[PDB]
Amino acid sequence: QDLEFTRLPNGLVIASLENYAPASRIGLFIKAGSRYENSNNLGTSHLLRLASSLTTKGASSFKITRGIEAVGGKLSVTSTRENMAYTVECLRDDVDILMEFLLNVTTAPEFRRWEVAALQPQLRIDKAVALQNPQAHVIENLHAAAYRNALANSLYCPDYRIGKVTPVELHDYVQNHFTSARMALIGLGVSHPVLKQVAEQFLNIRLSGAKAKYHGGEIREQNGDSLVHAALVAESAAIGSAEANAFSVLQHVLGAGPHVKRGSNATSSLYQAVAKGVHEPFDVSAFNASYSDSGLFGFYTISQAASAGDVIKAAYNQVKTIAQGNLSNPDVQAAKNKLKAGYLMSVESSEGFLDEVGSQALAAGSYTPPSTVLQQIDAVADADVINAAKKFVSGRKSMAASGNLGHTPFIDEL
């Protein structure tokens, strides 16, 4: 079976792929990430990410949470600095119910006053579980340091903002960003006319965002942890540009993450380069982030306190060698075999598949099948792979780090 793909006059994409699978599935990818949050309404998407299960017009916060659990589905909300998915699942015998629950979330949220009040202090837990995993305030400060206006808005909500969010400060948001011109009622395990029915009957309804003006800057977090974390990046390019596909392969050239469980990561140029001289624990890998307007590229650090500089000055020097022409072709064609795999393996699962069918539909307007991508990986140039790192090295630098920072250098000391 093949993938339908359409478009209404309202600009509302649809998709459908009746794989004759038992487990239906739906996604509604939307552009409402943290970037469209201005200075006043910070952290609102964090709240709105929890605002599922709340009251609607078509049903209550109670009926939703029980009707779903009866049929046995889900209601998950993946969200990014760009996008805001309202994914679900179910058995295909009972889609017509769960669809009705969904669009009442988006098309008719009441966002009553008091249900919010119970829902705010949940954030102090949500925000807290993440930062047990220390990456997600290292990585946030990058966007806070590097970019300025839109993409610097963390997914998560600042502390002081909690206790103070307004419901009007959602209605204004929903009526300005859940708009049929920039949505995508994706489907799966389900037929196409069914979705074409519902969208025209409920989603047949009617702001913008500024661009990520890169700056170049550094933020520091002396927070007493026993280890160090650090990231060092430079201006990447957005997706769709073939300049992207040179980075995304240059990722695996340089540091990919472990492909072998408990492996020495031999083929990684960077991790191998650290392994000489260093004789203590560490780990390190590439960081590629490619948003619609812009992106970032660099690497991410894990080391002890004293050995931050002695590790970062392996990465920076190494990538210079990758920019000074010192490179081979089989590394690339080996690296492509990784990139050509992770794309396919990511879309192995229906969910990871579903993450890609629509993420294209919002920035782009057409579904690129896997084959057409693998050509774009084959048509890559070893003068783009280089540049690439030339853009990184010569480019302005943004940086952040967390842990003990008594021996961690700035940019300029590199």
Binding site: R49, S52, S53, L75, V77, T78, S79, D126, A136
Partner: peptide, 17 residues
């Protein structure tokens, strides 16, 4: 890695990367 949030009604809240 390009970290992404996820909460739910029944899936454990998580941090994709």
């Amino acid at each position: 890695r390009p970290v992404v949030a996820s909460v739910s009604l029944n899936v454990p809240a998580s941090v994709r990367y």
